[PDB]
């Protein structure tokens, strides 16, 4: 019932009628909300005639001498009426500590969020956006910030607020179907108002739970931007018991203009100017209230924007017979499901097959969601359809063909695509002065916002401490996790006679019985384990195994290494496997027969072959090559996957060593059968080599590290490290790689670059912790481990 009034409660922070930020969206405003709270008379700027006016309640904002006390001046009031300078016109001045008024307990945070602000728009600079440019140059900025997939508004805004991947927070798209609710979420309508959609703990809640008052972050679209700023500014003059410490402004710009005209249309200047004007109003307003050297300002975008036109559309009807029986979420991604339930005609395998490699230059690729690059983190939610289409940048996928084309831009693509990257600036007392920082992922910001407000963050996907280098003052000191399982160091115990593994090798020429020091540490750790042993962060049993060319941590539970570490120097050579050794597998005399793989299992498994974690190709001598054929270096591999793995080991490792002045390589298996991005417990493992307890990995990883200063070799690096990593799907076919019938030099590297990963992604998937013994600080190492080599 709307017969109630908004008198003296406009934009309060509180059946009965509403007067708040979102009442328009919920259709619940009092009758006089428009009249009393959305006042527009005389615009947003004081004029010289209006200075020292008698107060009129009709006006949008005021120019009377009481306004500064009442906190409702137009933002340019001191400039126009009291001869002051605009904030932008002032020189850049370091803020060495927070200069807040009496009774401020902590510096406030204002988040200024923009929609579809591509990173490259910052290259326009002060000619177009002078306020933004001062914030960028005076404060802390990165060249770009990486959004989450899909690169759409709601998943990203809510990711920014929570620190969570969309699969965890539940906003997996602007449109979603939950098959358990049997309901569809959209941007339009009331379904989105149901609490059941919105998981995680957003910042405003984290703050409120810990006694830190929050302003409402989102705004009904009809509230003009100037009024949003004025409201925030009014809230900042409230008494201590009401005044929030965290605030957000949101703008829908420059998204729509991007859609209509494209990211490089000349029409983009006007929206970028209008955004900067609003920033200017904020900064001037802060300055009037003596808060310009008190508040932290974050300027952040949700996602970027790409050139897309109508003529660049693929249609499912060119690939599939019956597009009337499926539902497609289309555009810059595709999600496919059955339109109706209990349709026995629906055949997901046949749909994917018909969508796989049907023409050269096909502008989308189908995937089962568990097979998508792990770096996307886009599977562990029942609202993500099993069938997913990754669409090529600049293209759309639609169901069927059915005038002028009205769009020239769109977004939603793979979050590593350059055009999708967006903006980050941090300005104010807690941010660093005139500091450039490397690109980072939007998931990391929630931890930072929590640090800026003295809050304990809720569990999230950030790596707390990885952005300590953004801040002048760090409240959070990260601590390395405790090692859970200590390594065993088994020495030489067993006779070759003790083993009955069904393996054979022509190895009687070896001097193992003669060699008293066989497999002692010697020089192995120094040369092959450059950053300390990985810590095993779960309860298990494993053995550290030394060899001439490599070191491994061999799990007696999975019957294979969790990691294998080795260094390849710039001038390392490749040697082939001699004919008499092609099928050589040798028992490991340190490891019990009962905790070893057996060769009969591979022989009986007609689908499964094996490979090696340390490649025999990189052996330092013919003698040393025999260590690479140990049963404890063996892992189960599909023949299809061996094409990939052999090329990587034989060709690419040496290439990388050559290019990077040596590399250190750590490789191992991953088990993620339930596609949650987390190391599987034994119960979750769903495939074994036939008749055995040798589990089959879902993925194989490698972490390839060298010196950032490539003039120093990898094993003698004084300074920062350079890392690139991958998580390759362990698949029984190469259907993902459309050119896989060709030589591996035509497709394997492309596959690997698509499956690039963060060291942190591997840590979650293995419950290992890398880079524990280095010359670098632990926060530097956390930065290193969050790095993603994108290949853009
Ligand atoms: C990225 O970070 C995430 C957060 O750390 C990681 O996700 C977390 O993973 C762990 C380990 O698997 C899960 O732990 C199990 O939790 C079970 C209880 O879950 C229920 O309660 C959770 C806690 O609830 C309280 O606290 C939060 C504050 O953090 C408040 O917001 C709550 O109101 C409450 O006071 C709750 O967070 C959890 O949330 C999920 O489920 C609801 C539906 O009930 C969804 O609305 C929501 O979006 C979350 O769904 C996600 O997680 C579930 C798994 O729980 C998935 O199936 C689903 O597909 C979706 O991803 C829920 O209500 C407990 O019984 C078990 O013994 C474990 O302790 C966490 O639940 C999970 N949290 C979240 C938010 O996802 C994630 O692994 C990590 N990713 C990577 C790659 O590292
Ligand atoms: C709108 C949504 C993305 C979310 N915003 C942000 O993540 C957000 C994040 C930042 C950033 F700093 F992190 F970048 C800056 C600004 C922001 F806004 C958000 O505010 N809420 C969650 C949805 C919410 C409200 C609160 C909710 O909880 N429940 C039950 C609803 O029903 N909600 C809706 C959802 C949509 C609405 N349209 N109009 C009214 C609506 C109300
Ligand atoms: C697959 O395409 C073939 C034609 O190449 C067609 O006969 C068959 O019906 C299609 N199946 C599906 C599920 O679209
Ligand atoms: Ca798992
Ligand atoms: Ca293929
Ligand atoms: Cl509205
Ligand atoms: Cl303070
Ligand atoms: Cl949908
Ligand atoms: Cl069908
Ligand atoms: Cl859910
Ligand atoms: Cl530490
Ligand atoms: Cl022999
Ligand atoms: Cl154990
Ligand atoms: Cl080296
Ligand atoms: Cl030999
Ligand atoms: Cl093979
Ligand atoms: Cl350098
Ligand atoms: Mg043999
Ligand atoms: Mg076999
Ligand atoms: Zn957006
Ligand atoms: Zn858009």
End-to-end CA distance of the chain: 56
Residues having C-beta closer than 5 Å to ion ligand 12: 506, 508
Give the Å distances, CA to CA, from 669 to 334, 405, 585, 696, 717: 30, 49, 19, 9, 28
Tracing tokens 């050579």 back to the chain, one arrives at 573
Q: Report resolution in angstroms.
A: 2.0
Task: Tell me if 545 sits within 8 A of 533, measured CB to CB.
Answer: no
Judge residue 729's burial from the number of C-beta atoms within 10 Å of its C-beta, 0-12 exposed, 13-18 middle, 19 or more buried.
Answer: buried
b/e for 340-378, b at 16 or more Cβ within 10 A? Answer: eeeeeebeeeebbeebbbeeeebbbbbbebbbbbbbbbb
DSSP 8-state symbol, 550 = -
Which is nearest to 237 in space by CA: 178, 307, 295? 295
781 within 8 A of 773, measured Cβ to Cβ? no
DSSP 8-state secondary structure symbol assigned to residue 604: H
Please give the full DSSP string across 62-74, using - where no structure is assigned. B-STTHHHHT-B-
Q: Atom of ligand 3 at shortest distance to CA of 322?
A: 14
CB 297 within 8 A of CB 110: yes
Return the closest-CA partner of residue 427 out of 523, 297, 546.
297
Determined by which method? X-ray
Counting from 1 in the atom list of ligand 2, the atom nearest the Cα of 160 is: 13
| CA nearest neighbour of 248 among 171, 300, 172 | 300
DSSP notation for 6-39: -TT-TT------B-STTTTTTT-B-TTHHHHHS-
- CA distances 694 to 229, 386, 451, 588, 628, Å, are 62, 28, 45, 16, 19
Output the CA 780–ligand 13 centroid distance in Å. 33
Task: Give buried/exposed letters for 633-672 (b at 16+ CB in 10 A, else e).
Answer: bbbbbbebbebbbbbbbbbbbbebbeebbbbbbbbbbbbb
Given a contact cutoff of 8 angstroms between Cβ atoms, the answer to whether 332 and 151 are in contact is yes
766 is in an annotated binding site: no
Nearest alpha carbon to residue 44 among 220, 269, 224, 238: 224
Whose CA is closest to atom 79 on ligand 1?
461
And the tokens for 565? 């570490």
Tokens, residue 51: 């200075």
Residue 737 assigned to a binding site:
yes
How far apart, in whole angstroms, are the C-alpha atoms of residue 476 and residue 454? 9
Cβ count within 10 A of residue 683: 8
Query: Which residue's CA is minimally distant from atom 21 of ligand 1?
Result: 200
DSSP β-bridge partners for residue 543:
488, 554
Task: Tell me the CA distances in angstroms from 772 to 531, 532, 552, one per residue in order.
Answer: 6, 6, 16
Going by their DSSP bridges, the two strands 183-185 and 176-178 should be labelled as antiparallel
Measured CA to CA, the distance from residue 246 to residue 95 in angstroms comes to 19
State the distance from the centre of ligand 15 to the C-alpha of 225, rounded, in angstroms. 76
- Which residue, 473, 463, 526, 500, is CA-closest to 599? 500
DSSP state for residue 576 in the 8-state scheme: -
764 lines ligand 1 (CB under 6 A): yes
> Is the CB of 22 within 6 Å of ligand 2?
yes
Query: 77: helix, coil or strand?
Result: helix
Pure H helices in 203-342: 203-209, 225-235, 255-261, 269-288
Rounded CA-CA distance 708/776 in Å is: 13
Is any ligand 1 atom within 6 A of the Cβ of residue 169?
yes
Q: Is 225 annotated as a binding residue?
A: no
Domain CATH for 628: 3.40.570.10
Q: Is 420 annotated as a binding-site member?
A: no
Give dist(CA 380, CA 59) in Å, integer: 52
**C-alpha dihedral over 251, 254, 256, 262, to 10 degrees?**
-170
Range of the domain at 635: 496-786
Q: What CA–CA distance (Å, rounded) separates 690 from 330?
A: 41
Nearest to 154 by CA among 104, 218, 209: 218
DSSP string, 643-694: HHHHHIIIIIHHHHHHHHTSEEEEEEEE--TT-SSSPPPGGG---BSTTSS-
Work out which ligand 3 atom sits closest to the CA atom of 351.
Answer: 13
């Amino acid at each position: 019932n709307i017969s109630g009034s908004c008198k003296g409660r406009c934009f309060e922070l509180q059946p009965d009628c509403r007067c708040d930020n979102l009442c328009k969206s919920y259709t619940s405003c009092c009758h006089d909300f428009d009249e009393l709270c959305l006042k527009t008379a005389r615009g947003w700027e004081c004029t010289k005639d209006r200075c020292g006016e008698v107060r009129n309640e009709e006006n949008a904002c005021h120019c009377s001498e009481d306004c500064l006390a009442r906190g409702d001046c137009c933002t340019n009031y001191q400039v126009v009426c009291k001869g002051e300078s605009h904030w932008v016109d002032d020189d850049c001045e370091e803020i060495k500590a927070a200069e807040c008024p009496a009774g401020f307990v902590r510096p406030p945070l204002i988040i200024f969020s923009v929609d579809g602000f591509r990173a490259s728009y910052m290259k326009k600079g002060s000619k177009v956006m002078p306020n933004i440019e001062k914030l960028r140059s005076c404060g802390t900025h990165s060249p770009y910030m990486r959004p989450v997939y899909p690169t759409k508004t709601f998943p990203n805004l809510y990711t920014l607020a929570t620190g969570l991947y969309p699969e965890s927070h539940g906003i997996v798209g602007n449109s979603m179907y939950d098959p358990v609710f049997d309901a569809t979420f959209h941007l339009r309508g009331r379904e989105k108002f149901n609490h059941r959609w919105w998981g995680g703990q957003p910042l405003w809640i984290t703050a409120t739970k810990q006694g830190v008052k929050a302003g409402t972050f989102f705004w009904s679209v009809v509230i003009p931007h100037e009024r949003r700023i004025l409201t925030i500014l009014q809230w900042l003059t409230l008494p201590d018991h009401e005044r929030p410490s965290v605030y957000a402004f949101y703008s829908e710009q420059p998204d729509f203009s991007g859609h209509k005209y494209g990211p490089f249309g000349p029409e983009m200047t006007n929206p970028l100017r209008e955004i900067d004007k609003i920033v200017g109003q904020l900064m001037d307003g802060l300055k009037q209230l003596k808060l310009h050297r008190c508040v932290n300002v974050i300027f952040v975008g949700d996602h970027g924007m790409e050139d897309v036109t109508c003529d660049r559309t693929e249609f499912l009807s060119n690939y599939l017979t019956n597009v009337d029986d499926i539902t497609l979420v289309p555009g810059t991604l595709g999600r496919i499901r059955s339109k109706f339930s209990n349709n026995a005609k629906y055949d997901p395998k046949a749909i994917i097959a018909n969508l796989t490699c049907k023409k050269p230059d096909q502008h989308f690729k189908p995937y089962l969601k568990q097979h998508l690059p792990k770096r996307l983190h886009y599977a562990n939610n029942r609202r993500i359809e099993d069938i997913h289409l990754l669409v090529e940048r600049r293209w759309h996928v639609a169901r069927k063909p059915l005038g002028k084309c009205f769009f020239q831009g769109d977004h939603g693509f793979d979050n590593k695509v350059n055009s999708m990257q967006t903006v980050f600036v941090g300005y104010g007392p807690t941010f660093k002065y005139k500091t450039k920082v490397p690109p980072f992922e939007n998931i990391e910001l929630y931890n930072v916002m929590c640090d800026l407000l003295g809050l304990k963050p809720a569990p999230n996907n950030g790596t707390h401490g990885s952005l300590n280098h953004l801040l002048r003052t760090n409240t959070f000191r990260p601590t390395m996790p405790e090692e859970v399982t200590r390594p065993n160091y088994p020495g030489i115990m067993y006779l070759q006679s003790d083993f009955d593994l069904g393996c054979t090798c022509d190895d009687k020429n070896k001097l193992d019985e003669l060699n008293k020091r066989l497999h002692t540490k010697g020089s192995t750790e120094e040369r092959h384990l450059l950053y300390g042993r990985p810590a095993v962060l779960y309860r298990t049993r494993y053995d550290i195994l030394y060899h001439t060319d490599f070191e491994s941590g061999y799990s007696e539970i999975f019957l294979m290494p969790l990691w294998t570490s080795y260094t390849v120097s710039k001038q390392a050579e490749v040697s082939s496997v001699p004919d008499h050794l092609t099928s050589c597998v040798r028992p490991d005399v340190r490891v019990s027969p009962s905790f070893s793989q057996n060769c009969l299992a591979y022989k009986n498994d007609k689908q499964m072959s094996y490979g090696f974690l340390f490649p025999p190709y990189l052996s330092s001598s013919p003698e040393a090559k025999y260590d690479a054929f140990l049963v404890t270096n063996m892992v189960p591999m599909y023949p299809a996957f061996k094409r990939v793995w052999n090329y990587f080991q034989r060709v690419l490792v040496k290439k990388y060593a050559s290019e990077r002045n040596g590399v250190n390589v750590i490789s191992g298996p991953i088990f993620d059968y339930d596609y949650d991005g987390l190391h599987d417990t034994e119960d979750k493992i769903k495939q074994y080599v036939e008749g055995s307890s040798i589990p089959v990995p879902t993925h194989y990883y490698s972490i390839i590290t060298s010196c950032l200063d490539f003039t120093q070799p990898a094993d003698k690096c004084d300074g920062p490290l350079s890392v690139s990593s991958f998580i390759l799907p362990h698949r029984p076919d190469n259907e993902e790689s459309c050119n896989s019938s060709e030589d591996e030099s035509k497709w394997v590297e492309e596959l690997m670059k698509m499956h690039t990963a963060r060291v942190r992604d591997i840590e979650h998937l293995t419950s290992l912790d890398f880079f524990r013994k280095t010359s670098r600080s632990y926060p530097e190492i956390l930065t290193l481990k969050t790095y993603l080599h994108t290949y853009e």
